[PDB]
Amino acid sequence: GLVPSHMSTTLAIVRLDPGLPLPSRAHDGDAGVDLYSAEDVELAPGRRALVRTGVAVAVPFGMVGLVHPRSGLATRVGLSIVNSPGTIDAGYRGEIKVALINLDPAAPIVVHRGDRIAQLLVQRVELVELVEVSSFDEAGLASTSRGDGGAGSSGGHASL
Amino acid sequence: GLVPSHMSTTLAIVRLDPGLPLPSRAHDGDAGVDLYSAEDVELAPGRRALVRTGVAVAVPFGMVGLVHPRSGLATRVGLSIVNSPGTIDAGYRGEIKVALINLDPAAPIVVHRGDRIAQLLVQRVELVELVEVSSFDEAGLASTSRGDGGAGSSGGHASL
Amino acid sequence: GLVPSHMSTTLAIVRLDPGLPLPSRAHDGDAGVDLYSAEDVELAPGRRALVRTGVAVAVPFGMVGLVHPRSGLATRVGLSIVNSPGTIDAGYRGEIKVALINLDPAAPIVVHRGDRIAQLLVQRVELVELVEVSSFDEAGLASTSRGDGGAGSSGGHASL
Ligand SMILES: O=c1ccn([C@H]2C[C@H](O)[C@@H](COP(=O)(O)NP(=O)(O)OP(=O)(O)O)O2)c(=O)[nH]1
Ligand SMILES: O=c1ccn([C@H]2C[C@H](O)[C@@H](COP(=O)(O)NP(=O)(O)OP(=O)(O)O)O2)c(=O)[nH]1
Numbered sequence: 001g002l003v004p005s006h007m008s009t010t011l012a013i014v015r016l017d018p019g020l021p022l023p024s025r026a027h028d029g030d031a032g033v034d035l036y037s038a039e040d041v042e043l044a045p046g047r048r049a050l051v052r053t054g055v056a057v058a059v060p061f062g063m064v065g066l067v068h069p070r071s072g073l074a075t076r077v078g079l080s081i082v083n084s085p086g087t088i089d090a091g092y093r094g095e096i097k098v099a100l101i102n103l104d105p106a107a108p109i110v111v112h113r114g115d116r117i118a119q120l121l122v123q124r125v126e127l128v129e130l131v132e133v134s135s136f137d138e139a140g141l142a143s144t145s146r147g148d149g150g151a152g153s154s155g156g157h158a159s160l
Numbered sequence: 161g162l163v164p165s166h167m168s169t170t171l172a173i174v175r176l177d178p179g180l181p182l183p184s185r186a187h188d189g190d191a192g193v194d195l196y197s198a199e200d201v202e203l204a205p206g207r208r209a210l211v212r213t214g215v216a217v218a219v220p221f222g223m224v225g226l227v228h229p230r231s232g233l234a235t236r237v238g239l240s241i242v243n244s245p246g247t248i249d250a251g252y253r254g255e256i257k258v259a260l261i262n263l264d265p266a267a268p269i270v271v272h273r274g275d276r277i278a279q280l281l282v283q284r285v286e287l288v289e290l291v292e293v294s295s296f297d298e299a300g301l302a303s304t305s306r307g308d309g310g311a312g313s314s315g316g317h318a319s320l
Numbered sequence: 321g322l323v324p325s326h327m328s329t330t331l332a333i334v335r336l337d338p339g340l341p342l343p344s345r346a347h348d349g350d351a352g353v354d355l356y357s358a359e360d361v362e363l364a365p366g367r368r369a370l371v372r373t374g375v376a377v378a379v380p381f382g383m384v385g386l387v388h389p390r391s392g393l394a395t396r397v398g399l400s401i402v403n404s405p406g407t408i409d410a411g412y413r414g415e416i417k418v419a420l421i422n423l424d425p426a427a428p429i430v431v432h433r434g435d436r437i438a439q440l441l442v443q444r445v446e447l448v449e450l451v452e453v454s455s456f457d458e459a460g461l462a463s464t465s466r467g468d469g470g471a472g473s474s475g476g477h478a479s480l
C-alpha cells in the first residue's frame with residue numbers, strides 16, 4: 001500500500017465483464033496493461049471484428065489511452081488492429097473495443113474469451129490550440145532542415 | 161479568450177486548402193483533432209492512396225505529431241493507414257498526407273473531400289541521445305524481469 | 321560535448337550487429353531514429369517477416385520505445401508493421417525486431433541489410449495504477465460530453 005511512484009497515475013476501471021482479470025502489465029516497467037477478449041471470435045484471413053474487452057476506463061483529462069497490438073500474435077498469426085493505435089479519449093466512458101484483423105493470407109485466427117489480445121498504454125497528450133497562420137514565415141518560424149521533406153526524402157531504401 | 165490550460169500548447173497551422181474547416185476535437189478532452197481529406201478518393205480493396213489533408217502544421221520542437229486512424233471507419237469499412245501512426249516531425253513544414261488503405265476484402269471505400277479521415281495527436285517525445293555500450297551489464301544496468309523476453313513470451317493465447 | 325537539451329534522455333544501445341550504423345534522426349527535431357535491417361528479406365504480397373535490427377536498447381523505466389513505420393516505404397511499396405506501433409518495454413533487453421508486412425497486393429518488397437526500415441521513438445508513459453470501481457458515477461466522475469460515444473459517433477463520413 002505504500003507509494004514508493006509518488007506521481008504515478010490512477011486509472012478508474014469498470015469491469016463490465018467481471019469474469020475477466022483486471023488488465024495487468026506482464027513485467028514491471030512494461031508500457032501497457034494487457035486487455036482481454038470478452039468473447040470468442042474467429043477471424044478468417046482478411047476479416048476484422050470489433051471485439052469487446054469487458055472494461056471501461058476513465059483516461060484522465062490531458063491523457064490518452066492507446067490500444068496497441070501485441071507483438072507475439074502479430075508475428076505468429078498475423079493479428080493486427082485496424083485502427084492501431086486505438087485512441088481512447090479522456091471523455092470516453094464506454095467499453096473499450098478492439099478492431100482485430102487477421103492479416104495472415106491463409107490461416108484463421110481463433111480468439112478465446114480470456115485471451116490477451118491487445119495492450120493499453122496511457123500517455124499524456126498535448127491538447128493543442130491551433131493558431132492559423134497564412135504562412136510559417138509570417139508566423140516568424142525559422143526554416144528547418146527538414147523543410148517540406150517527407151515521404152522517404154531521406155532515402156534508406158532502393159524504392160525511395 | 162481567457163486561458164483558464166495555462167501550459168497548453170499552440171500549434172501553428174496553415175490551411176493549404178482554405179475550403180476545409182480547421183481540424184477540431186470531436187469532444188472536449190479528445191486526444192486528437194480530426195484531419196479532413198482535401199480530395200475525393202476511391203480505394204478498391206487492398207489499395208492505398210496518399211491523401212492530402214489541406215493542412216500544414218509546425219509541431220513544436222520536442223514534440224511529435226501523430227496521425228492515427230479513426231475507429232469508426234476502421235471497423236465499419238476497414239479503413240486504415242499504412243504507416244500508422246504517421247509520424248509528423250517537428251521540422252516538417254509540408255502538407256500532412258495520409259496513407260489510407262482499404263483493408264476490406266471486397267467493398268471499396270469512397271472518401272469525399274471534407275470527410276474526416278484521420279486524427280492528429282501531438283505529444284512530447286524524448287530526443288534521445290544514444291549511448292553505445294558493449295553490453296548492458298557493462299553499462300551497470302540491473303537485470304530486469306523481462307530480460308530478453310518478447311514476441312509473446314508472456315503467453316495469453318494458444319499460439320504463443 | 322556541451323549539453324546546450326539539459327534534460328534530454330540517454331538511451332543505452334548495444335549494436336548486436338556492429339556492421340550497421342547507429343540509428344539516427346534524419347533531421348534535427350525528428351521524432352525517431354531510424355532502425356536498420358540487419359538482414360536481407362523479400363516479402364511477397366501479404367507476407368510478413370520478423371526482421372532483426374541489430375540493436376538492443378534500454379528504454380528508461382517510465383518510458384516506452386515505439387517502433388513506427390516509415391512513411392515513404394508505406395506509400396511507395398505498401399510496407400507496414402503488423403504490430404505498429406511496436407511497443408518496446410523498459411525492461412526489454414533483447415534485440416528489437418520489426419514485424420514487417422507487405423500490404424501491396426502484387427509487388428514484392430525487397431529489404432536489404434542496411435536499409436532503414438522503421439523508426440524508433442521514445443516517449444514517457446504513465447505506469448497506471450488501476451482503481452476498480454463499480455461505476456464511474458460511483459467514483460464521483462462527472463459525466464462527459466463524449467459519454468460512451470465511439471466508433472464513428474461524431475460522423476464525418478457517409479458510412480458512419
Ligand atoms: O503520416 C504521415 C507521416 C509522415 N508525413 C510527413 C511528415 C514527416 O515529418 C515526414 C517524414 O515522415 P517519416 O519519417 O515517417 N517518413 P520517411 O522516413 O519515409 O521520410 P524521410 O526520409 O523524409 O524521413 O513525412 C506525413 O505527411 N504523413
Ligand atoms: O515491435 C516490437 C515490439 C515488441 N518487441 C519486443 C520488446 C517488447 O518489450 C517485447 C514484448 O512486446 P509486446 O508486449 O508488444 N508483445 P507480447 O505481449 O506478445 O510479448 P510479451 O508476452 O513478451 O509481453 O517484445 C520488439 O522487439 N519489437
Ligand SMILES: O=c1ccn([C@H]2C[C@H](O)[C@@H](COP(=O)(O)NP(=O)(O)OP(=O)(O)O)O2)c(=O)[nH]1
Binds near residue numbers: 088090186230471
Ligand atoms: O481502439 C479503439 C479506439 C477507440 N475506441 C472508443 C474510445 C474513443 O474515445 C472513441 C472514439 O475513437 P476515435 O475517435 O478513434 N474514433 P471515431 O472518430 O470514429 O469516433 P468518434 O466519431 O466517436 O470520435 O472510440 C475504442 O473503444 N477502441
Ligand SMILES: [Mg+2]
Binds near residue numbers: 026070119314
Ligand atoms: Mg506484452
Ligand SMILES: [Mg+2]
Binds near residue numbers: 230
Ligand atoms: Mg474521433
Ligand SMILES: [Mg+2]
Binds near residue numbers: 154346390439
Ligand atoms: Mg523519416
